[PDB]
């Protein structure tokens, strides 16, 4: 009686890839019959395959601020390379070993095909012209317009483009003159309810202006010729031109080089938790600013003694998760999440509770280089300290 | 579907599409096989020495 | 108790190639729907394959002084020879041994296909005519001009 | 996108496209297979002489 077992392989076809993707439109106009070209990169810049989307991955319409498939649905699969979706995306033995070791595989977006839908004047219907596409149009928008990026609404980058005058082109000098103030008014929704530019009750001086080099050289010459120094006084005397890039950010925060706010300065870090809803050893409801709500990683729970002593519960990297989102906008950070479902056993009501914060400019994912899996490599801010007999 | 701020003549209207990846599913193309065998025999023999 | 171990090969399909390429326009006019024909040369002048770019490798617009894909993105893969991108590029055993020994493989650029986009007087738009390419135009530029 | 120098009637506007190779990835097509097996037997020789 025998018993055998065989296991073959082929070192050019060892594994097959299936990728779950989702399309986003964040512009100002819809795009029809969408087909993105996209490439799967392994490691630094070693491309496995480049796949124009087949007929299975076609989005018929992507209206702005929408998704395909919509966010309550599972993503679509991109798993073929043949023009008829019959041949998979494959990888050899060395790429498979490197992917299993280092786990680095990302997805680039090289371009997007898509059609335009125009108004038919006879019956009023809107019809998709399948000859014209958006690749013949956007390079004419990008060469005649100034660009302004702005994150004064939910700290999200919103990009607009405003038709400004190029002075060395006869057709482009026929457009109307564009100031920076009128561009801010008609592009985003700034107004002057008393005489001062405001974005929903926030003054213009609460934002700062960062330009590109050519744009900053132009703005500097405009300020020299105006005999002015502050840009905030001559906002209706700054002429925009084509191919400008202006970036307007909220002045409080610190940003990385993708312009994402991750950390504020310490005074407004402390000034965010003034009115308090729930204060018990069971939980903590709190009214926090929505702007500073998302920039922080998580809070730490410990108890301040009279002698001087703290009882660090969140002394690790894993459970710096603290939040639990409720339907009122206020998260309830209830303290039986990492405590074997127990309250804070304060043994003496002459004690104080103590809550410190972690921001993402000091948050780490790995442990330290030695054996430190603690909060020894982070920097914290003081927020919450009351006395211990009004807690219960 | 053109957003209302882009109904001005001086604000452009254009889409900004980008794909993002939520999951990668790899599947090791490898073929395997088992086998079981029984074998009986019976021999009779004789010599004249 | 036995343990076996097998290898396999085929001396006309021993290895498959996958080149990472990136186009660049250094002219003064854009070119649309770009599809270069290109050639993989092993060693001195021995050519393994000539591949017109398929539909996965097409650039929709290549403006002057720009790359495709732009230089914060990884290059694109050219790994198929069939018209429908369902057949890999292939070298035999002697070519594979010579490429592993000497490591010489370059990429010639024989020609480039691409379209022209012309102004439309009635509505100001700019429309790519897919019936006229730049190879009807550019030999007329080359014969009446000075460089 | 026609560059400013070529907005003159006497300067030609044409593209100069050129492809350059950044990386070459060869993958040796070769199939390999392993096999493990083990077997037991029992013979009962009843013999007369």
From Swiss-Prot, chain A:
Residues 253-392 are annotated as: Domain 4, binding to the receptor. Residues 1-144 are annotated as: Domain 2, membrane insertion and heptamerization. Changing residue 79 to C: Loss of capability to undergo conformational changes that lead to pore formation and translocation. The record marks 84 as: Phi-clamp. Changing residue 314 to A: Decrease in toxicity due to decrease in cell binding. It is a multi-pass membrane protein. Changing residue 347 to A: No effect on toxicity. Changing residue 345 to A: No effect on toxicity. It is found in: Host cell membrane; Host endosome membrane. Changing residue 209 to A: Loss of toxicity due to defective oligomerization. The record marks 340 as: Essential for binding to cell receptor. Changing residue 346 to A: Decrease in toxicity due to decrease in cell binding. Changing residue 343 to A: Great decrease in toxicity due to decrease in cell binding. Changing residue 211 to A: Decrease in toxicity due to defective oligomerization. Changing residue 84 to C: Abolished ability for mediate LF and EF protein translocation. Changing residue 171 to A: Decrease in heptamerization capability. Changing residue 20 to D: In strain: PAI. Residues 145-252 are annotated as: Domain 3, heptamerization. Homooligomer; homooligomerizes to form homoheptamers (PA-63(7)) or homooctamers (PA-63(8)). PA-63(7) or PA-63(8) form ring-shaped oligomers that are in a pre-pore conformation, which do not penetrate the host membrane. PA-63(8) displays an enhanced stability, suggesting that this form circulates in the blood to reach and exert toxicity even in distant tissues. Interacts with lethal factor (LF) and edema factor (EF); can bind LF and EF simultaneously and interaction takes place following homooligomerization on the host cell membrane. Phe-84 residue forms the phi-clamp in the pore and catalyzes protein translocation via a charge-state-dependent Brownian ratchet. To pass through this hydrophobic restriction, substrate proteins LF and EF need to be unfolded prior to translocation. The alpha-clamp consists in an amphipathic cleft between two adjacent PA protomers, which assists the unfolding of substrate proteins LF and EF. The alpha-clamp binds non-specifically to alpha-helices of substrate proteins LF and EF. This is Protective antigen PA-63. The lineage of its organism: Bacteria, Bacillati, Bacillota, Bacilli, Bacillales.
Curated annotation (Swiss-Prot), chains B, D:
It is a multi-pass membrane protein. It is found in: Host cell membrane; Host endosome membrane. Residues 28-49 are annotated as: Disordered. Residues 32-49 have a biased composition (Polar residues). Homooligomer; homooligomerizes to form homoheptamers (PA-63(7)) or homooctamers (PA-63(8)). PA-63(7) or PA-63(8) form ring-shaped oligomers that are in a pre-pore conformation, which do not penetrate the host membrane. PA-63(8) displays an enhanced stability, suggesting that this form circulates in the blood to reach and exert toxicity even in distant tissues. Interacts with lethal factor (LF) and edema factor (EF); can bind LF and EF simultaneously and interaction takes place following homooligomerization on the host cell membrane. To pass through this hydrophobic restriction, substrate proteins LF and EF need to be unfolded prior to translocation. The alpha-clamp consists in an amphipathic cleft between two adjacent PA protomers, which assists the unfolding of substrate proteins LF and EF. The alpha-clamp binds non-specifically to alpha-helices of substrate proteins LF and EF. Mature form that oligomerizes and forms a pore to translocate the enzymatic toxin components edema factor (EF) and lethal factor (LF) into the host cytosol. Following attachment to host cell receptors and cleavage by FURIN, homooligomerizes to form ring-shaped oligomers that are in a pre-pore conformation, and associates with EF and LF. Toxin-leaded complexes are then endocytosed in a clathrin-dependent process, followed by a conformational change of oligomerized PA-63 from the pre-pore to pore state, which is triggered by the low pH in the endosome. This is Protective antigen PA-63. The chain holds residues 275 to 323 of 764 of the full protein.
